[PDB]
Design a protein around this ligand. Structure first.
Ligand code: NAG
Ligand code: NAG
Lengths: 108, 483
């Protein structure tokens, strides 16, 4: 009877918490993508070369949202992202709360 | 009518599974019940049960004869106990009154209350042997009837499995387990597969980590002189740091456990009370009193050494024997290929220039479902055990809480950078912390002349984390931290 409105409210709540701290979420996302790229490289290649991301995007700087320019799309990354987005309810709420915590640790 | 076919099929499955699990886990049940019967009635004629099933667990070759010996002795005891119930036994003609002592010689420092053994009732020369002349004769003999039943049901299960091998021609499964198909390769596929793998080979991977915890339980719940002896041997065996370094002294440890449980039962049996001689620590000139004579596990009449304290030593002995068997059979390649390769790893490695060599697959990005559990148990547990170290140093306010707080602060400050280093230094520091923990345990045991529960949990979590640091799954986290 009321589970529909309950789920609507909790989904709106997670959307709110994700929206008010989108900057940290996107920074963490692009950092995670770069981490995956760098660990694949260091597993295959030789040297980390911190500027590897620089010489990589230079092919095809200051831009807080690099997500529209998808430059690295290794399949297991999208597999993990799909696994995270298909997570059940009352758990994405936990993800949003943890993102809020890591975003506002100073206030915490 | 309608469901009897499928129901009987399920029932046959259940019957064969029960027979299999009993064939797999019979020795533990029979030995545990025998030790419990021995502890219940402490008198003689049960000392031989303890000899048999204390020198039979570590040495499996004797497990055949050590069963028939008990099978014969229990019926001998039943016959004797029934014979001791006739009306023509007359313990009156048998009983002895021990004469009171005087204030000068062999005096009890508590002279106004001599209410103890040898003085509050006429002693019987057979009570010290086992015959007690009880009336119902059924509640008096059930501890032996059930023991005989278990001893018979053992060989019953053995020969039933043999006959099941004969008909429906099969072979004895060398893979002694429950799920014969689940193996090491099937571990990191699904959560259910991991649960099956752990139900299969839990004790294989976590033997020592459990034997040490059992010894710590013995120390913490016994808390007397023999607990100090157990602490001495625990520190002596842990001092050998490498795994293969203690696989040499484990038989000596098992022999020590057997000898000590034998000595403890021979102490708890006391001295024959028919001769009215008393113990040297109860004379005219003596300094031992009730508290110190209870702490020391010495024989006595006014205070009885609690026999139930031997079940902890028995648990420790059983786990030590199982771990000895594990050490014995873990080098065989046939089992090493399936849920094997339990040898420790080198300590000079690094996540860089090695992530392409380890057989373990990556889990940091959490493709599957259990990978979240893997990353929460291999990366986010260090800080949890640090919080546990903090908690165990603010609950029981004592002088030993300084080391806990110091180590907690140090690791919580210099933690993030230490995981960059090769595991050598972090393992050295964690070993120093293990040493401090066990030293605190031993000192809190010695100073009893308190109640360590948080220290045991801290020790368990530290052992878990130490086992984690020497795993292949950690190099992926080290690579992520490098990134
Ligand atoms: C021993 O003492 C009891 C009661 O104190 C008495 O009944 C008995 O006759 C005495 N002599 C014995 C049992 O030898
Ligand atoms: C104990 O020995 C001393 C010296 O032999 C004596 O004076 C005393 O009466 C004896 N009896 C007691 C109860 O001490």
């Amino acid at each position: 009877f009321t589970w529909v409105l309950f789920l609507a409210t909790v989904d709106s709540f997670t959307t709110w918490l994700n929206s008010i701290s989108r900057e940290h979420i996107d920074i963490s996302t692009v950092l995670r993508i770069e981490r995956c790229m760098l660990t694949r490289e260091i597993k295959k290649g030789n040297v980390p070369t911190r500027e590897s991301i620089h010489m990589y995007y230079q092919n095809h700087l200051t831009a807080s949202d690099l997500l529209m320019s998808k430059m690295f799309h290794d399949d297991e990354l999208e597999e993990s992202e799909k696994f995270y987005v298909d997570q059940p309810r009352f758990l994405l709420l936990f993800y949003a709360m943890y993102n809020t915590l890591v975003a506002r640790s100073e206030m915490v | 009518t309608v469901l009897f076919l499928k129901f009987l099929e399920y029932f046959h499955k259940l019957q064969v599974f029960m027979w299999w699990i009993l064939e797999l886990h019979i020795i533990k049940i029979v030995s545990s019940y025998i030790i419990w019967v021995t502890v219940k009635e402490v008198s003689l004629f049960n000392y031989v049960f303890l000899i048999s099933w204390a020198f039979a667990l570590p040495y499996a070759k004797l497990r055949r004869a050590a069963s028939s010996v008990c099978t014969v002795w229990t019926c001998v005891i039943i016959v004797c106990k029934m014979l001791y119930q006739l009306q023509t036994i007359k313990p009156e003609n048998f009983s002895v009154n021990c004469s009171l002592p005087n204030e000068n010689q062999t005096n009890i420092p508590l002279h106004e209350l001599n209410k103890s053994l040898l003085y509050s009732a006429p002693v019987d020369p057979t009570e010290w042997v086992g015959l007690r002349k009880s009336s119902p004769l059924l509640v008096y003999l059930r501890n032996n009837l059930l023991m005989l039943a278990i001893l018979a049901f053992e060989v019953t299960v053995y020969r039933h499995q043999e006959y099941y091998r004969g008909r429906n021609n099969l072979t004895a499964p060398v893979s002694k387990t429950i799920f014969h198909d689940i193996t090491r390769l099937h571990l990191d596929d699904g959560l259910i597969n991991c649960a099956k793998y752990f139900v299969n080979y839990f004790f294989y991977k976590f033997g020592l980590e459990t034997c040490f915890l059992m010894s710590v339980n013995v120390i913490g719940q016994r808390m007397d002189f023999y607990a100090m002896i157990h602490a001495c041997w625990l520190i002596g065996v842990l001092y050998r740091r490498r795994r293969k370094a203690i696989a040499e002294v484990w038989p000596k440890y098992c022999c020590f456990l057997a000898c000590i449980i034998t000595f403890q039962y021979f102490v708890c049996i006391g001295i024959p009370p028919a001769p009215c001689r008393d113990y040297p620590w109860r004379f005219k000139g003596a300094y031992f009193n009730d508290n110190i004579i209870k702490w020391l596990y010495f024989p006595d009449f006014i205070v009885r050494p609690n026999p139930v304290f031997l079940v902890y030593d028995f648990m420790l002995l059983l786990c030590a024997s199982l771990q000895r068997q594990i050490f014995e059979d873990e080098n065989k390649a046939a089992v090493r290929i399936m849920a094997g390769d339990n040898v420790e790893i080198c300590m000079n490695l690094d996540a860089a220039s090695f992530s392409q060599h380890n057989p373990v697959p990556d889990f940091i990005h959490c493709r599957s479902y259990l990978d979240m559990s893997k990353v929460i148990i291999f990366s986010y547990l260090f800080w949890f055990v640090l919080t546990i170290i903090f908690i165990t140093g603010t609950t029981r306010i004592s002088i030993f809480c300084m080391g806990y707080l110091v180590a907690c602060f140090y690791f919580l400050l210099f933690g993030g950078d230490l995981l960059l280093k090769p595991i050598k230094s972090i393992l050295r520091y964690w070993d120093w912390l293990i040493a401090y923990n066990v030293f605190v345990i031993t000192m809190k045991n010695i100073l009893s002349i308190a109640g360590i529960i948080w220290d045991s949990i801290c020790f368990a979590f530290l052992l878990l984390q130490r086992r984690v640091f020497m795993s292949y799954y950690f190099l992926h986290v080290v690579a992520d931290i490098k990134a």
